[PDB]
Design a protein around this nucleic acid. Structure first.
Lengths: 160, 106, 181
RNA sequence: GGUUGCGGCCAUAUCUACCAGAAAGCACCGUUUCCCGUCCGAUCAACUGUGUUAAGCUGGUAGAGCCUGACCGAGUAGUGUAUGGGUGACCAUACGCGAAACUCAGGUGCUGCAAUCU
RNA sequence: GAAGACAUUGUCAGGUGGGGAGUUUGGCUGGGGCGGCACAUCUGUUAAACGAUAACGCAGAUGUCCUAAGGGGGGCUCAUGGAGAACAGAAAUCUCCAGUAGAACAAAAGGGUAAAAGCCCCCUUGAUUUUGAUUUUCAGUGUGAAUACAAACCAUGAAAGUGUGGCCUAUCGAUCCUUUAGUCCUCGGAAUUUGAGGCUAGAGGUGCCAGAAAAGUUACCACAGGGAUAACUGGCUUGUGGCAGUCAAGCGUUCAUAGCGACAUUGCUUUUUGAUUCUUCGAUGUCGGCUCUUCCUAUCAUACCGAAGCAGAAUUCGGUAAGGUUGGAUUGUUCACCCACUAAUAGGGAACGUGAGCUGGGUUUAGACCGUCGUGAGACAGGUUAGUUUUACCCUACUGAU
RNA sequence: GUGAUUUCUGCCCAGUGCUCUGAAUGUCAAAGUGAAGAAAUUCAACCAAGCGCGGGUAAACGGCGGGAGUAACUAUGACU
RNA sequence: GCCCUGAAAAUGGAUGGCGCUCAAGCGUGUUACCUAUACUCUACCGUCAGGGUGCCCUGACGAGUAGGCAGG
RNA sequence: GUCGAAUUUGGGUAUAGGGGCGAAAGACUAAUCGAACCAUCUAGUAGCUGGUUCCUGCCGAAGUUUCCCUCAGGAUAGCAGAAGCUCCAGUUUUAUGAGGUAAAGCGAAUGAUUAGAGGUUCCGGGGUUGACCUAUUCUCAAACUUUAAAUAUGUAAGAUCCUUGUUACUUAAUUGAACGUGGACAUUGAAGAGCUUUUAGUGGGCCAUUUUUGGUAAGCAGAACUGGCGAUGCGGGAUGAACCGAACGUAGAGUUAAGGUGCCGGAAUACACGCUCAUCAGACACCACAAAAGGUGUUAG
RNA sequence: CCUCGCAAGAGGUGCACAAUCGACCGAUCCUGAUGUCUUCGGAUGGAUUUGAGUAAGAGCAUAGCUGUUGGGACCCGAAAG
RNA sequence: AAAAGACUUCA
RNA sequence: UCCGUGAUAGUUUAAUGGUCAGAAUGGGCGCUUGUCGCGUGCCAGAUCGGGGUUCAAUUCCCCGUCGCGGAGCCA
């Protein structure tokens, strides 16, 4: 047929930054290193030239699975088809930004978590939630078997 | 096409040198005769008529351009290494040559 | 000109199109001028301002725009003379019209191939005139109110989108507009 | 009252009148023989002080620029959702949402570490 | 008799070789050709999308150029418009100020960046070899591409680092065989040489670009099928084409409207033309004409009427209104031209009414000629002469009879 | 090949076709002589008819044009 | 709004028909009726939950071409 | 038409299949000729048309994407099913970035109108001033492609901790984390559901709704998002694949939807009122037409 | 399962299974000891891609059946050579 | 044994 | 009407590598020659209109205007 398919096409709104974001990015962002299990958005800065993902991946959130030299390895899930696999993306730190939402989420659950401990000692807020969590569980916890369980619905039978 | 000079220093792939050393760069045309080739099959297939599979190659498509056609030959060890794909016409050599600058005039 | 009623043009066709790269050799703007009468005059002498406003959402032809506006102008300049009051056209004509231009009989149909096929060869300009939009904004003196109204009536039978004459308010009226000095 | 190292948020810090870090917490000027820049000590690369607050950094003070809000415009333009009306095109209706100007306001920066002061 | 190591025969080599033979002879595509590119592949919009998204959709590029147009670092900051300088206009030039991405960045597009990735000066070769996690390819499918390494090796650089080709988003070739490269394996008693086979890699054509060795004609035709697709009839639409309405610029001596009437504009019809691809390719008989019927109203005449620029009077325009509308010449013609007639010699439909009625002149088979084109076969919406008309009515429909 | 007669049948050998002489110069096969050589394999003396390189050839297929300017009126254009 | 005017077509009249017009029109409110295989329920056949002893029971779901499988 | 000659013809008789035979039409070679016929190879092969024969149950389609001498087909995912294995899915809310399209900014800019007002450059007349053309600059009517803030709206991915020891690690004999282990401690939803083998019909769709893109338009072309038809009965709508109601084992009773109640035709010639008198008119959608112009002293506001 | 407490449940102890990890045996690719010392045969160790081995250990045989290629290949249909 | 053309005026 | 193909001084036509434009004729200029003319010396372009790219455009794109060839099917 006709025309291309193509990485660069349809980027004009996404690639481009605001009047305020315009100008060289700040090397602090370039410098930043992250740990595994951190939650990071991927959306490329227009003002960096290289390290850029496929354009089609921007606005997705992933977890830093591992790092191998300057660029980092991100797990994200795409969509549509049969037995879709989760993807690894090599995407630079300039393009990767923290996510506040889990950080404040983590503080709140943990801040809460202290309030409870005192209640577990001397206090009864609950009671029903208390019953599963002592009987429940190891995993250790923290494992790669839970990932295929999540992986399996992402290829959705109905949508198809 | 492009000036690359014939005598250069670059890395030699071979285990004997393993360092940057002098190479001579050259195009490599065609060679056969031995007959223990495609040529053998042809002799056999052309008797009477056909030839069959020899028949391919030509008539022409045409094209315009080739890609790069090189040996880089060490003169320390006289071992060599080949190069990876690049687009070239043609190629410009001379046993030296610049493309220099300069000036003025021209 | 060449017939097609305005059955072809009036309903709101097309992702616009009139973009400057994408159309060398459009046929002209035929509108003679946009402001008329006393061009050398501010708005503020005139105590009366009359407007003509749309009921429908349309594309008006360039020829209809000039024909309506000249018909109004002949009524104004005959009754109020040459150095009359002052008129402004609200809507200029810049939406570009494609139509395919008269085949052949060669059994050559479209000779193209079979076809048609974008890149249609331009037929001229139109103006978007959407619901409640104002085609003419005319500034006058109350002892010639009647004259502008018949000029606006003689304008209406020269575009197809149904429109209404109206007396304006904007900012102010014309005299809450004036007290600061 | 904080000058300044190193930064971060990076249009609340772009631009154009004029007051201030300063008798031993600056900039300048002077040695520009020279490592050093050359095409000129200008650039720069270096060694230093008559002293001077004029610029410099930055602090003091005023407008166009701009973010942020209040005020109408007042839920207006537009909008997914379910549907009535219109000759057509087109419109409305309930269900959830909601931009443009206007004028007024805040700010001619913020924040953190240290060289840490008369 | 002639002749004689020739010639002729046997065999082979080169050249010619549609006589003959086997074959192929490009896809998309608002019919297939023709024309072209939308055969590979990138863009800016389409695109409502995270991703994936069509049309021969819009606009628009790539099949190169490059050892500097790579690398790195130090050092500088633009395009520019004003001013300033005899001459100089193109006038560089140089100078000063003001100058944030409007410049530069080889090349589309768009994006993107100010001690920069830009500009300059030096120094240099990492445009190295090896392996490539992964994405794009493509959601699993290759080449290719890219983003990251680690080993191997160097550069510049103060060094950290950077540097896995080209401002950024990424810039293309499988497969035999060949070539070449590596150090090494290998070819059947032993033993010695040659040249084979092969390991991993690079290069040599395939742009019919995830890959064939490759031209037409058929009107002498043939076959399988298709209304998945044309000519057609019907239908849809109605640009066109016919006709009407509104408005009324204007002209009519003066006077919009006796009459004529532009621009513009809304309609209506389905009877020209196009458009489509719904219907029919186990078959709808073509145009035209004849003749027989029934109809329509947008009425040409007749009847009744209105207006007039109606004196009469020929008349002009218009309303109501569907109860006749010649015969001929040319042409196959429809159409039309043209002649005398007439009251006037209207237009339209009924499968362009009408082939189980006729006709058969044209279109439109098979033979032939000419112009033109084609090497040729043979072709033209080029012209021309000749060139076929099957069926015994079951049902229905109805003239008539019972 | 053309088409009784009768008057006549003009120009064009560039392409294509065909052909002519080629005792001498660039291309042109094999066996074949030579060179390296254990073999062969590479290469090189030597050329036929053919390409070239030159003449003939249309009652051989066929072919027989392109813009201007210009009359002591204008139109045409003998002529440049 | 209504309505006429704009408003012309071909074998024969219709809004499905007759065709009523303080409606059998059209709009505004409103009362009562009618009406599916729907929904509910009764009985019961398959599947699956299951239970229980070659057999019995509970409740849910349950059109079907291409087509797969399984019992007859 | 020919008919005394290239005439006519009888017998005997020559020439046989890319061959014969031709005053050459591709005519003719025993009803067969752009290549006889007979038999064989043959049960050629045909992405092509047609057909393929008993019941039942549970589930139940696809007409899409890449490749392909490929588009009337293959191929491979895409969409279904069985047979078993093993015991988690969703959603507001939070946070992110993003469609868009209206009025500013940049770039383009038709394109007016334009006052005020500095400066071009020419000549040309008069008493430095001061007529004459271009043109900054603050400054004004709407369009279009970027961008703010978009407003929107669908989206649209995303929802354990500690201590102890021991090991590693990249990075000055230098500073640190973060790795891995070993051990102990303490924490609105509901079967919508994981994996495997093998299997089939495509690999030609259609309509509507919404958002479109081309096309005058179209019972058009070509996308997106979704439902239906295909493969879905039954009830409504005159008829009528995709309009409404409705998803259907059997059978019955009840009551309803959609939609209807003068008659045909269940069921009202219902009730309160108002307009209309043209037979308007008995009409959601629909081959349901009716406009510009709309008169208008029709009625009403 | 047991140790339990018992209509819950954890901690031990043993592991199918699947996911995750390492580790080895050959192939490559690279240092190559011990060394013999004409010659060169080969421990160690690592990186790699692939293939193999252990908790990823098992068939073969016939059977009735499905699919696939085939042979005419479900059946017929053509002009054909 | 020859390069070379026109011609155009006043009883 | 599509696809092909062009255009340069008064006129016909050569030409380029992005930096440079010609010829021939026709004319205007003398001298020849009784006098004109032939001859013989001398002379002189907005490269069709158009916008764009670049350092630099006659030269490279894009469009029109005109003059040309080539198509034209089954009705």
């Amino acid at each position: 047929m006709g025309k291309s398919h193509g990485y660069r096409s349809r980027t004009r709104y996404m690639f481009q930054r605001d009047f305020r974001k315009h100008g060289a990015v700040h090397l602090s962002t370039y410098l930043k290193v992250y740990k595994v299990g951190d939650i990071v958005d991927i959306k490329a800065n227009g003002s960096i030239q290289k390290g850029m993902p496929h354009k089609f991946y921007q606005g997705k959130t992933g977890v830093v699975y591992n790092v191998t030299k300057s660029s980092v390895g991100v797990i994200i899930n795409k969509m549509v088809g049969n037995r879709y696999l989760e993807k690894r993306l090599n995407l630079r730190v300039e393009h990767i930004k923290h996510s506040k939402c889990r950080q404040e989420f983590l503080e709140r659950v943990k801040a809460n978590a202290a309030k409870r401990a005192e209640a577990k000692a001397q206090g009864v807020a609950v009671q029903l939630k208390r019953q599963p969590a002592q009987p429940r569980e190891s995993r250790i916890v923290s494992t790669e078997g839970n990932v295929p369980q999540t992986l399996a619905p992402v290829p959705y039978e109905t949508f198809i | 096409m492009v000036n690359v000079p014939k005598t250069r220093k670059t890395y030699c792939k071979g285990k004997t040198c393993r360092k940057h050393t002098q190479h001579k760069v050259t195009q490599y045309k065609a060679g056969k005769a031995s007959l223990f080739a495609q040529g053998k099959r042809r002799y056999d297939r052309k008797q009477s008529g056909f030839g069959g599979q020899t028949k391919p190659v030509f008539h022409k498509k045409a094209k315009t351009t080739k890609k790069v056609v090189l040996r880089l030959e060490c003169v320390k060890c006289k071992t060599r290494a080949q190069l990876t794909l690049k687009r070239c016409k043609h190629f410009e050599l001379g046993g030296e040559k610049k493309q220099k600058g300069q000036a003025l005039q021209f | 000109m060449a017939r097609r009623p305005a059955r072809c043009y009036r309903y709101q066709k097309n992702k616009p199109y009139p973009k400057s790269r994408y159309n060398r050799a459009v046929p002209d703007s035929k509108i003679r001028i946009y402001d008329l009468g006393k061009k050398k005059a501010t708005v503020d002498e005139f105590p009366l301002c009359v407007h003509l406003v749309s009921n429908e959402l349309e594309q008006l032809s360039s020829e209809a725009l000039e024909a309506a506006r000249i018909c109004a102008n002949k009524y104004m300049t005959t009754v109020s003379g040459r150095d009359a009051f002052h008129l402004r056209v609200r809507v200029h004509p810049f939406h570009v019209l494609r139509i395919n231009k008269m085949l052949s009989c060669a059994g050559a149909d479209r000779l193209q191939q079979g076809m048609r096929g974008a890149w249609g060869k331009p037929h001229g300009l139109a103006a978007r005139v959407d619901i409640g939009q104002i085609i003419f904004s005319v500034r006058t003196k109350d002892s010639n109110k009647d004259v502008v109204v018949e000029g606006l009536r003689r304008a209406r039978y020269k575009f197809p989108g149904q429109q209404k004459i109206i007396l304006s308010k904007k900012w102010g009226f014309t005299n809450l507009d004036r007290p600061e000095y």
